[PDB]
Swiss-Prot record:
Cited CDD domains: PTH
Organism encoding this protein: Streptococcus pyogenes serotype M49 (strain NZ131)
An example Gene Ontology biological process: protein quality control for misfolded or incompletely synthesized proteins
Subcellular location(s) of the protein: Cytoplasm
Residues of the site described as Discriminates between blocked and unblocked aminoacyl-tRNA: 10
E.C. number(s) listed in UniProt: 3.1.1.29
Underlying gene: pth
Name of the protein: Peptidyl-tRNA hydrolase
Amino acid sequence: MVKMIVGLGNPGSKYEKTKHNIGFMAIDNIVKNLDVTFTDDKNFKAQIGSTFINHEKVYFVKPTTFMNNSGIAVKALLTYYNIDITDLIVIYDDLDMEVSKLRLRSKGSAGGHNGIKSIIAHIGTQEFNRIKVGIGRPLKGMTVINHVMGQFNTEDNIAISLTLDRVVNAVKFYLQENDFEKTMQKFNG
């Protein structure tokens, strides 16, 4: 009945172009496509848009707790609406994929990603559905922070935009089928 779709990132003008905000960018593209408007929530520290698709109510969420606190918002939202982990999708930047690459997974450990780390620690599992967008592989010796805090190279803007459009379609397919596994089969590769 209720779907919780979360895009990760950091609030504030200075973070807006960072690769670590690919989740925010994805959610933005999704709601614009779906004609869904945001509202900076009074209960939750997040930007939230929702709408009924058929008989289901879908929430599109951009936590504004800062990335390392994403789990607090996710857990609050799951608890508030009595939504099980299985009804979750998290959209975010993969730390070790070529830029604009798209991958759907239903698992994976945090691997240095502070948002995913927070979510895992708050909902108690790494077994949750993910739509990952590649931001580039870090060079040897490069720290996670300056890897994800950098902006996208201008030659990559088009690839990123193309990928985000694909994320919109994956979400729609997912909603149509209420099956993330089929969505993974339909979109991976």
